[PDB]
Amino acid sequence: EYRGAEKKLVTLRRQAASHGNYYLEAKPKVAVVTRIRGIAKVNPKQRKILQLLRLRQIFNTVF
Amino acid sequence: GVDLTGISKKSRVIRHHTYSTNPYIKLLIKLYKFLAKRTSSGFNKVVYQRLIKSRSNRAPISLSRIAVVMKRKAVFTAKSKAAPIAVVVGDVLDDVRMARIPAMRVCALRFSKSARQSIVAAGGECLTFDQLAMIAPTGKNTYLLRGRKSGRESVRHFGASGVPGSHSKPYATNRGKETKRGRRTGRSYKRKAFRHV
Amino acid sequence: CAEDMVNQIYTCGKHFRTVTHGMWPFKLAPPAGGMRQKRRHFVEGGDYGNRDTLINRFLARMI
Amino acid sequence: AKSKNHTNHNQSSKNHRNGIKGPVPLHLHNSKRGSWLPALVNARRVRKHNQKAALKKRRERIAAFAAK
Amino acid sequence: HSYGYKSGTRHLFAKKFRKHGVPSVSTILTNIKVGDYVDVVADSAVREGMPHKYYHGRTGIVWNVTPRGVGVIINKPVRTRTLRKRICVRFEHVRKSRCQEAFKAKEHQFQAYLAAKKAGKALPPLQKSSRLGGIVRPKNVEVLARRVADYEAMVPY
Amino acid sequence: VKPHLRHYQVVGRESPSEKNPEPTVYKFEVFAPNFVVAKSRFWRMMRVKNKVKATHGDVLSCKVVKDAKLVARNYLVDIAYYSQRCGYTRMVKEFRDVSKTGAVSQAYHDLASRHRARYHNIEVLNVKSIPDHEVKHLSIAQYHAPNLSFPLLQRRTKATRKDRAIFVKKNTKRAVVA
RNA sequence: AUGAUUAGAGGGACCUAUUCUCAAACUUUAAAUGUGCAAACAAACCGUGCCUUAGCCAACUGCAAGGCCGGAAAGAAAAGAAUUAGAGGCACCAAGUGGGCCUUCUUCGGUAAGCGGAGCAGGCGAUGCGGAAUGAACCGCUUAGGGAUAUGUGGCGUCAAAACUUAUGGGCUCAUUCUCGAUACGUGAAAAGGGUUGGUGGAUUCCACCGGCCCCGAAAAUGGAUGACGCUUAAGCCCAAUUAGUGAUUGCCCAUUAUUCCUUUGGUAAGGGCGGAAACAAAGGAGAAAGUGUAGCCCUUCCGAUGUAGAUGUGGCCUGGAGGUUAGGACGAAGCUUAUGGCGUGAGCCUAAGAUGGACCGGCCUCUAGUGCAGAUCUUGGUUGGCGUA
RNA sequence: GGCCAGAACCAGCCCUACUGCAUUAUCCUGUCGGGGAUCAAAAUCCGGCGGGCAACGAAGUGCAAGAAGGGUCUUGGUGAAAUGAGCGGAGUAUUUGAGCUGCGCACGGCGGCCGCACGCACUGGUUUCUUCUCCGUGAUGCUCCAUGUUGGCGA
Ligand SMILES: [K+]
Ligand SMILES: [K+]
Ligand SMILES: [Mg+2]
Ligand SMILES: [Mg+2]
Ligand SMILES: [Mg+2]
Ligand SMILES: [Mg+2]
Ligand SMILES: [Mg+2]
Ligand SMILES: [Mg+2]
Ligand SMILES: [Mg+2]
Ligand SMILES: [Mg+2]
Ligand SMILES: [Mg+2]
Ligand SMILES: [Mg+2]
Ligand SMILES: [Mg+2]
Ligand SMILES: [Mg+2]
Ligand SMILES: [Mg+2]
Ligand SMILES: [Mg+2]
Ligand SMILES: [Mg+2]
Ligand SMILES: [Mg+2]
Ligand code: NA
Ligand code: NA
Ligand code: NA
Q1: Among chain A residues 2-61, those with CB within 7 Å of any atom of strand H
Q2: DSSP 8-state assignment for residue F48
């Protein structure tokens, strides 16, 4: 499935490009988020968001 | 470091061993810790939790309350089936206001002497928890019961009595003292009997 | 299986929440080679922004 | 001497320490005391009748169960 | 020092420009029932049964209806808890609240869909995500660039 | 060393809606260190020119434009920078380079050196290879004379890193401490 | 609109159209950030379903309220269509606090202040560690005790780990007794002006104008401070790299951080085993307790671990007596001495040796109290440097 | 020998060495015209036209999914459960990519006619070349501790 999906995207881009058109890529659905700061001096809203993201420690990472 | 803000708020105070010095309570706790670990019964689990509890939290029960609830269960119960064994992890006390009770099987930690006499004279029998473990090892066909604690004097004294909507008793040795300013409209003000929550 | 979780995560499948919620948050090492500036946005020459797919280089050094 | 009178500086922190507890659900503590008296009186009459109907319904249920 | 009942209400309890006047007939004719969600908005032209300034712009449930008044339960934080304050106002200071309009529409749509599926009728077509990719065929294609005239123009004088 | 800036073409548009069903497509040159920066600059231009925010727009394509073959050329760089004291200053400078990215990276280093102007306050209006006879400054024009030749004087030819020494005998290459 | 306000123009003033300027106690308009409510399980929806009511309505099968009887419930679709290190509720009994201070944005009084007063939020106080030479509060990171690896902030000429002074990177800069520069917070400056090399617009190389760096403007009291030396093909400033137009996207050095390994300890802890498995002597061993807590029954697993004031726990330590139970002592009790080892995270325990002593006393369970000292210008006794001094 | 040290292997970690897919066009090349410059040229540059892969290790552009030498005084062991692509047995094959191919269906122009870059289904055909694949061990072990090699020192 992965190989076929990438090949179909390649073909779609080639066909768009060959006629002066464009291929708008699908919006990414998944983000990978890693915390890059320690736990000091965090304001309440940011603290709450990072807790709901389960990013409670530096270099913790989620999808 | 990991941000665990007030993680100590989520820790709960639960009794996990008994403060009792009674060796027989300890034997019963052994028996029912084994039964709660090695069986699927919820009855054994709750019996174990109640067995390790403080005496204040094992409120006593009256014989009349047992009889009334066993009657409410007996109707809508097929007359083929036998009455359940009433189980209380606590004390059964006699009741002078109910002379006529049916034959009931009751298991309790302790019976008052007059309660035991009344139960036997009505045709029932008083069980101990080891006999119950022998004949109902998973508590099938039992009625777990708790005594009442809301009528306690300490409960009646809890909270400030001078705030609106409170009807707690004050800590006072002299009943006639503290019947003036704060309790009558003609003495400055009266604490309000009702307040919307 | 592992590839079931990988597929659910990667394609944002109908069990994305079940799979990610069922995992412990990922606990990563600091990026070998270091960062640029944790206090500046990636666009400003720092590290804290949305860096699109260059997050994969970052995570490769971290994983 | 002369010193600081008022500040609210640490107070929302303290209030959020054990959180701002949310309100009691509306279906709890919904006492009708003090509301419009005529409607209250009528509703009390209906409630008395409904208690009587519950008692009769339980009696009939006991009889019908005992029939089986 | 001054903390009156209506302290600091100069702009709060004031009519909007060219919108002065006594409340309207629709307000008189609206029926308020116990359990209705209402917005508490003070009408500055009445000055009877007017809510305290705190409750302006709060939404609560009606607990009581009197011949000329409405009892509303309003949440109010104080220290570490939120109380349920029962305020008494005249009906002119409440508006039928629209806070549950989307939820009522959703429930109505679900009942309608259930009825249609029971009847075997045609369900509406599904909306599609605009975020999926595809071919773009442009009509006009222009160069996006900074020119000299921009710096020339955004200088005054 | 190779230029620190790459040559990007970012093609994007506002997302089509009910108010704009076939939105215009914009092509944007920009010289940036990576494509994330290139798209950031593209959205800045879209915002400040077409009033289109990135939160309501699409990126149709973001590609590096390859450099041509390396030839000693003259480059006209039309460039602008902002400073608080003087506002926007636009200049047209000439550079000797071998690529457009080389000329633009050189222009950025030059603006940083002689005007203390950093990357994000600089907009490149146009870079263009021009013929020699259209070169205006003598410091660039001197470099395309037919008989251009010069010695290499005052050079600091450091040794290869492996053969570098701390102490050397005065008139030999005999390393003493290394 | 209300107030303040300059000037002309048209019918000395008035008017009419505006025009120069504007307000904490003016405003038509009007953000950002905010702030209420809702988003299906004691609820809501459907039936014109039944009962009840001294409720409303002229009556009603309509409206209101409480119930009963059922039906249906993507248990909340699809359209970006949430997330949770997301068990909610309810009590009881108590401590310390009730002098704060700093910073970021917003600010009020004040010429100003390391001044005084507020709002929001993070801090120090109560907290170290790494970094800014130094600093309660700045940057980084916050802490069981240990290793490895990798980072953060900050660095990579010596001091001082790191470019043994990196590049096969571009520019700019000269400074004479105040030392140019390398000073985030912050800790050395203005109005104004003039070497070099950049820009813009005109004129025939010069005219004006605008930047960069440097210079002048720039005067204080012990000798002195980019931290010191020094550095000028920088070891300075702006910019940009990672072994360099070769062929791809981690140069290097430092944390009480991150990852991982090992050990401890405690859980709102999570699981197993515990009916001796069968046999088995000396010239594979041993253990296996149904258990809060011990040398913890035993094994496995996960997570947390700092802390002033303060709270609480501990088959936690220690001292004088009592009820018990077990011991020891003239072949040497108590006390006392220690480069006197062992055990315990620790309070401490125990052994050894006295070339000490001379007669009582240890362990364990429970009971009990005048029960633990470094400081109170603490009490009493003794000693002591000053001092072979005045 | 329960002490010091050195080499071997094992298991687990940690550094290696080895790189495929897509993209390039504001690009590459030939020739006309101009324009340039010096003694004359060529070149730098601009428009056409015909061709195209700049293919060295092409390009410092996006994503990489490449199994198995050296480190462990940074761990524990020497087979007192080797659970394995690594051990022990069997087979010389299955099947997964790369190719170039069939039917529709999707997918791109002009409105069914073309194409189709190797998309989906038929797990299609082929196999031209590239892989190794298939079985096996409970605990009648509840727990803990006990097993190599070579010297040095120790009689
Ligand atoms: K290290
Ligand atoms: K544990
Ligand atoms: Mg750094
Ligand atoms: Mg900061
Ligand atoms: Mg005070
Ligand atoms: Mg207003
Ligand atoms: Mg208290
Ligand atoms: Mg204090
Ligand atoms: Mg320091
Ligand atoms: Mg060094
Ligand atoms: Mg150097
Ligand atoms: Mg220094
Ligand atoms: Mg642990
Ligand atoms: Mg602690
Ligand atoms: Mg304390
Ligand atoms: Mg005593
Ligand atoms: Mg004493
Ligand atoms: Mg002390
Ligand atoms: Na800290
Ligand atoms: Na240089
Ligand atoms: Na003492």
Answers
A1: 2-8, 10-19, 21
A2: I
Q: Of B129, B135, B189, give the one whose Cα is nearest residue B163.
A: B189
**Pick from E73, E77, E84: which is nearest to D20 by CB?**
E77
- In the sheet that holds A33-34, the strands lie side by side as A33-34, A60-62, C26-27
Residues 85-124 of F with CB under 7 A from strand H: none
The answer for residues whose C-beta is within 8 angstroms of residue B141's C-beta and 6 or more apart is B81, B82, B84, B85
Scored b (16 or more CB within 10 A) or e, A18-34 reads eeeebbbbeeeeeeeeb
Q: What letter does residue E153 receive in the DSSP assignment? A: H
Q: Do chains B and F touch (3 or more CB pairs under 8 A)?
A: no
| Backbone Cα Rg of chain F | 23
Give me the half-sphere count of Cα atoms (radius 13 Å) on the Cβ side of residue C19.
Answer: 17
Of B145, B152, B113, B182, the C-alpha closest to B47 is B145
Distance E82 CA to G360 C1' (A): 75
Helix, strand or coil for residue F60? strand
Check whether E11 is labelled as a binding-site residue: yes
Query: Determined by which method?
Result: cryo-EM
**CA dihedral of A23, A26, A32, A37, whole degrees rounded to 10:** 70
- CB-strand contact B42/G, under 7 Å: no
Q: Tell me how far the alpha carbon of residue D22 is from its chain's centroid.
A: 15
Task: Give the whole-angstrom CA distance, residue A44 versus residue A36.
Answer: 18
Write the single-letter amino acid at B179.
Answer: T
Strand G near-CB residues (< 7 Å), A 32-51: 37-45, 51
The length of chain C is: 63
How far, in Å, is the CA of E112 from the C1' of nucleotide G251?
69
Helix (H) or strand (E) holding E50: none
DSSP F122: E
- Burial class from Cβ neighbours inside 10 Å (0-12, 13-18, 19+) for residue F23 reads buried
Interchain CB distance below 8 Å, F25 and A22: yes
User: Whats the size of chain B, residue-wise?
Assistant: 197
**Angle of helix B63-74 relative to helix B113-121, nearest 10 degrees?**
30
| D35 has a chain E CB within 8 A of its CB | yes
User: Which own/partner pairs from E112-115 qualify as long-range (CB within 8 Å, at least 24 positions apart)?
Assistant: none
Q: Which amino acid residue lies closest to nucleotide G291, measuring CA to C1'?
A: B30
Q: Which helix (H) or strand (E) holds E136?
A: strand E134-136
Taking CA atoms, B3 is separated from A36, A39, D11, in Å, by: 14, 6, 21
